[PDB]
Design an enzyme around this catalytic site. Structure first.
Site, PDB file in Angstrom:
ATOM      1  N   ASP B  13      36.277  36.420  40.590  1.00 15.38           N
ATOM      2  CA  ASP B  13      36.002  36.435  42.024  1.00 15.38           C
ATOM      3  C   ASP B  13      35.632  35.049  42.543  1.00 15.38           C
ATOM      4  O   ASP B  13      35.435  34.858  43.745  1.00 15.38           O
ATOM      5  CB  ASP B  13      34.891  37.445  42.355  1.00 15.38           C
ATOM      6  CG  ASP B  13      35.287  38.883  42.035  1.00 15.38           C
ATOM      7  OD1 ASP B  13      36.454  39.253  42.303  1.00 15.38           O
ATOM      8  OD2 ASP B  13      34.433  39.637  41.508  1.00 15.38           O
ATOM      9  N   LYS B  16      39.743  31.497  41.136  1.00 15.52           N
ATOM     10  CA  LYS B  16      40.756  30.856  40.308  1.00 15.52           C
ATOM     11  C   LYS B  16      42.139  31.111  40.886  1.00 15.52           C
ATOM     12  O   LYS B  16      42.879  30.174  41.203  1.00 15.52           O
ATOM     13  CB  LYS B  16      40.705  31.391  38.884  1.00 15.52           C
ATOM     14  CG  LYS B  16      39.429  31.072  38.146  1.00 15.52           C
ATOM     15  CD  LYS B  16      39.517  31.593  36.736  1.00 15.52           C
ATOM     16  CE  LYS B  16      38.826  32.944  36.570  1.00 15.52           C
ATOM     17  NZ  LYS B  16      39.543  34.106  37.181  1.00 15.52           N
ATOM     18  N   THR B  17      42.489  32.386  41.018  1.00 15.03           N
ATOM     19  CA  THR B  17      43.815  32.765  41.489  1.00 15.03           C
ATOM     20  C   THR B  17      44.118  32.126  42.852  1.00 15.03           C
ATOM     21  O   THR B  17      45.276  31.838  43.170  1.00 15.03           O
ATOM     22  CB  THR B  17      43.978  34.310  41.559  1.00 15.03           C
ATOM     23  OG1 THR B  17      43.740  34.887  40.264  1.00 15.03           O
ATOM     24  CG2 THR B  17      45.380  34.675  42.013  1.00 15.03           C
ATOM     25  N   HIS B  70      39.231  38.542  32.117  1.00 16.23           N
ATOM     26  CA  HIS B  70      38.561  37.748  31.101  1.00 16.23           C
ATOM     27  C   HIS B  70      39.196  37.954  29.731  1.00 16.23           C
ATOM     28  O   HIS B  70      39.467  36.995  29.005  1.00 16.23           O
ATOM     29  CB  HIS B  70      37.093  38.127  31.000  1.00 16.23           C
ATOM     30  CG  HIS B  70      36.400  37.460  29.860  1.00 16.23           C
ATOM     31  ND1 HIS B  70      35.704  36.278  29.996  1.00 16.23           N
ATOM     32  CD2 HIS B  70      36.338  37.785  28.547  1.00 16.23           C
ATOM     33  CE1 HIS B  70      35.228  35.911  28.819  1.00 16.23           C
ATOM     34  NE2 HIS B  70      35.598  36.809  27.924  1.00 16.23           N
TER      35      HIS B  70
HETATM   36  N1  LIG Z   1      35.393  32.057  52.074  1.00 17.78           N
HETATM   37  C1  LIG Z   1      36.005  31.748  50.902  1.00 17.78           C
HETATM   38  N2  LIG Z   1      36.368  32.783  50.103  1.00 17.78           N
HETATM   39  C2  LIG Z   1      36.986  32.568  48.918  1.00 17.78           C
HETATM   40  C3  LIG Z   1      37.263  31.188  48.498  1.00 17.78           C
HETATM   41  N3  LIG Z   1      37.878  31.277  47.304  1.00 17.78           N
HETATM   42  C4  LIG Z   1      37.981  32.602  46.985  1.00 17.78           C
HETATM   43  N4  LIG Z   1      37.437  33.366  47.953  1.00 17.78           N
HETATM   44  C5  LIG Z   1      37.337  34.841  48.027  1.00 17.78           C
HETATM   45  O1  LIG Z   1      37.424  35.528  46.769  1.00 17.78           O
HETATM   46  C6  LIG Z   1      38.505  36.467  46.845  1.00 17.78           C
HETATM   47  C7  LIG Z   1      39.105  36.752  45.481  1.00 17.78           C
HETATM   48  O2  LIG Z   1      39.049  35.545  44.728  1.00 17.78           O
HETATM   49  P1  LIG Z   1      40.143  35.193  43.603  1.00 17.78           P
HETATM   50  O3  LIG Z   1      40.901  33.943  43.977  1.00 17.78           O
HETATM   51  O4  LIG Z   1      41.060  36.369  43.334  1.00 17.78           O
HETATM   52  O5  LIG Z   1      39.156  34.914  42.365  1.00 17.78           O
HETATM   53  P2  LIG Z   1      39.627  34.951  40.827  1.00 17.78           P
HETATM   54  O6  LIG Z   1      39.369  36.311  40.225  1.00 17.78           O
HETATM   55  O7  LIG Z   1      38.778  33.913  40.118  1.00 17.78           O
HETATM   56  O8  LIG Z   1      41.107  34.649  40.719  1.00 17.78           O
HETATM   57  C8  LIG Z   1      39.462  35.752  47.782  1.00 17.78           C
HETATM   58  O9  LIG Z   1      40.505  36.524  48.368  1.00 17.78           O
HETATM   59  C9  LIG Z   1      38.507  35.312  48.845  1.00 17.78           C
HETATM   60  O10 LIG Z   1      38.081  36.434  49.619  1.00 17.78           O
HETATM   61  C10 LIG Z   1      36.837  30.106  49.417  1.00 17.78           C
HETATM   62  O11 LIG Z   1      37.046  28.912  49.117  1.00 17.78           O
HETATM   63  N5  LIG Z   1      36.231  30.453  50.570  1.00 17.78           N
HETATM   64 MG   LIG Z   2      42.438  35.571  38.882  1.00 19.20          MG
END
Ligand SMILES: Nc1nc2c(ncn2[C@@H]2O[C@H](COP(=O)(O)OP(=O)(O)O)[C@@H](O)[C@H]2O)c(=O)[nH]1
Ligand SMILES: [Mg+2]
Ligand SMILES: O=C(O)CNC(=O)C(=O)O
Ligand SMILES: [Mn+2]
Lengths: 201, 380
Positions: B13, B16-17, B70
């Site tokens: 969350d 990364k993606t 993970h």
């Molecule tokens: N406001 C804000 N929200 C973010 C940012 N980066 C990620 N998010 C939130 O986190 C959600 C899911 O994150 P994701 O990229 O899938 O995280 P991952 O699981 O690490 O890949 C995104 O759709 C956004 O709602 C950012 O730079 N700013």
């Molecule tokens: Mg991801």
């Protein structure tokens, strides 16, 4: 025995070989019989194309029905695997290709099914080196179609009828080929010898 | 355009993606930028859930690996399905470091990831904690022997950059800045063919009249006629000269990384060499027996064990071209190990094998693969 020397010479000079009556007719009929026995039990399924996450049954490319072979399923096949392993070792000793193992499956093209032009080697995995196909069909004839067609060097094409006992061996990374439609059932035993990759797993 | 392997790691969350799509757009806008018909294969093995993207900076070309779960990171990092020349740790100012943040930095060390660059995401939501959060992470890295005090840290919000929508310097600019950092910090990696010769030995023949031959696929480097060589493993190290390279009955003057060939030795008797050993540029690789290793145990569903195991597990360790038995030594408090779980162990082999930190191996219980590991630290 001398028939293996031939395949090894052929691969060396031309990159492919075909041998008539590679196995005795009695064993070939039993392999055809094992193929039919499997079909009759729904154990053959639509074959697919590609590797890993993008492997899909695409029926506009490939339409044969298949099942993989392992040791201990039937003595006919154990005999086949043994012949193939004798080939593997010949090829290793004469060409130093480094063949480690052998995948093969029974393959049944229902009438109309085909396999469009392709390389056996994957676009992004180079482990496949030698392809081997053994046909199992009795009384085949040119009106039945269903030939393997190989694209050799210099634009040359060569057709092989899928006749009982016939074996075709080629460099998987280098000989594009396709299977044309046939008017009757087409049985075979297709496989690939392959060499080391970048990992064991 | 050199080929650099890169990938995002961090908690869930944290975005990364998102930094992944962000990188493609910032580069595509600010930096230029068919189906496989081959027959399916038999097995398949481990299922790596892994996404790939490509993007180009002015200086270099990047291949990028992102992962859903993970667990996916653990499988992919340990096998090498996702081997990085440098990793981008994504951490957020909003939440700060969390468990899977520690585990990934650690995991990167074990697996041999050379360099780590940090991107502090979700900067849009801030102030003053940025100073403190950097302090923590820097020491967090240093805790695992990465240059935590001398490591680059870019601050921004990927979601802006992706929508960018650069509001402060925290949007598009910061991703441009991240790429600029990869160009700078991660050195161009050394191609397999530019490394010291190495070839794991498969068969051993003697062709009537021309001497003894060993075959295999060359893993790295180049061997030329009259090159000195060592034979290393399973036996006391030996020297020899290459007197020829053969391939498809043609005689070559040199063998190259990737090529399956036979190498001709001088004097070496057919019985003085065996499968499992490696043909090596002298003093390039040494024999070893005891090492620490990160291992992933395969799931039941992936062809692995149907039941756990415990202390005194003596399985087969497959190193390149041969098996060798090893004793396993788990950390304190650890009694069981579940199929699909991953843990660190100290392995001691019955015989000596050629290895280096970062060598991948398989674990086998009776022919079939039941685990995949990587060498972390050589001990003896
Ligand atoms: N406001 C804000 N929200 C973010 C940012 N980066 C990620 N998010 C939130 O986190 C959600 C899911 O994150 P994701 O990229 O899938 O995280 P991952 O699981 O690490 O890949 C995104 O759709 C956004 O709602 C950012 O730079 N700013
Ligand atoms: Mg991801
Ligand atoms: O069936 C044939 O004659 C040829 N076989 C194949 O092309 C194959 O299965 O890859
Ligand atoms: Mn084919």
């Amino acid at each position: 025995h001398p028939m293996l020397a031939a395949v090894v010479d052929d691969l060396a000079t031309h990159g492919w070989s075909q041998q008539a009556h590679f196995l005795p007719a009695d064993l070939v009929r039993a392999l055809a019989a094992e193929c039919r026995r499997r079909d009759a039990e729904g154990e053959l399924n639509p074959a697919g194309v590609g590797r890993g996450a993008t492997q899909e049954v695409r029926e506009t490319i490939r339409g044969d029905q298949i099942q993989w072979i392992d040791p201990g399923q039937a003595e006919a096949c154990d005999q086949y695997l043994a012949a193939m392993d004798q080939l593997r070792l010949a090829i290793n000793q004469g060409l130093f290709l480094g063949l480690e193992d052998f995948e093969c499956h029974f393959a049944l093209y229902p009438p109309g099914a085909f396999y469009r032009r392709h390389l056996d080697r994957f676009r992004d995995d180079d482990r496949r080196m030698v392809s081997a196909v053994l046909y199992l069909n009795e009384g085949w004839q040119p009106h039945d179609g269903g030939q393997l067609r190989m694209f050799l060097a210099d634009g040359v094409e060569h057709d092989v009828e899928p006749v009982a006992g016939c074996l075709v061996v080629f460099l998987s990374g280098e000989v594009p080929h396709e299977v044309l439609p046939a008017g009757r059932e087409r049985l075979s035993l297709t496989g690939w010898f392959r060499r080391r990759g970048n990992d064991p797993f | 355009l050199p080929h650099v392997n890169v990938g995002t790691i961090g908690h869930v969350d944290h975005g990364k993606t998102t930094l992944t799509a962000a990188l493609t757009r910032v580069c595509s806008e600010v930096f230029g930028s068919k189906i496989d018909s081959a027959p399916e294969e038999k097995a398949r093995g481990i299922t790596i859930n892994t996404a790939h993207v490509e993007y180009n900076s002015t200086i270099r070309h990047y291949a990028h690996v992102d992962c859903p779960g993970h667990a996916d990171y653990v499988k992919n990092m340990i096998t090498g399905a996702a081997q990085m020349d440098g990793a981008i740790l994504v951490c957020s100012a909003a939440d700060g470091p969390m468990p899977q943040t520690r585990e990934h930095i650690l995991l990167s060390r074990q697996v041999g990831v050379p360099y780590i660059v940090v991107f502090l995401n979700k900067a849009d939501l801030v102030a003053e904690l940025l100073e403190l959060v950097e302090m923590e992470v820097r020491d967090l890295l240093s805790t695992y022997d990465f240059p935590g005090d001398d490591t680059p840290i870019i601050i921004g919000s990927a979601r802006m950059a992706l929508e960018g929508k650069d509001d402060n310097e925290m949007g598009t600019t910061a991703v441009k800045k991240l790429v600029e950092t990869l160009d700078s910090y991660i050195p161009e990696p050394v191609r397999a063919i530019d490394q010291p010769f190495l070839m794991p030995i498969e068969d051993v023949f003697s062709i009537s009249g021309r001497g003894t031959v060993v075959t295999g696929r060359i893993e790295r480097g180049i061997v030329r006629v009259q090159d000195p060589l060592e034979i290393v493993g399973l036996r006391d190290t030996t020297t020899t000269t290459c007197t020829g390279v053969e391939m498809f009955r043609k005689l070559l003057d040199e063998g190259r990384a990737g090529e399956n060939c036979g190498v001709l030795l001088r004097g070496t008797k057919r019985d003085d060499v065996e499968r499992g050993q490696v043909l090596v540029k002298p003093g390039s690789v040494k024999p070893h027996t005891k090492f620490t290793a990160e291992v992933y145990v395969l799931s039941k569903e992936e062809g692995g064990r149907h039941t756990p195991f415990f202390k005194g597990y003596r399985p087969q360790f497959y190193f390149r071209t041969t098996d060798v038995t090893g004793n396993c030594e788990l950390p304190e408090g650890v009694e069981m190990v579940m199929p699909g779980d991953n843990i660190q162990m100290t392995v001691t082999l019955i015989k000596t094998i050629a290895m280096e930190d970062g060598l991948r191996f398989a674990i086998r219980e009776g022919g079939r693969t039941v685990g995949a590991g990587v060498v972390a630290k050589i001990i003896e």
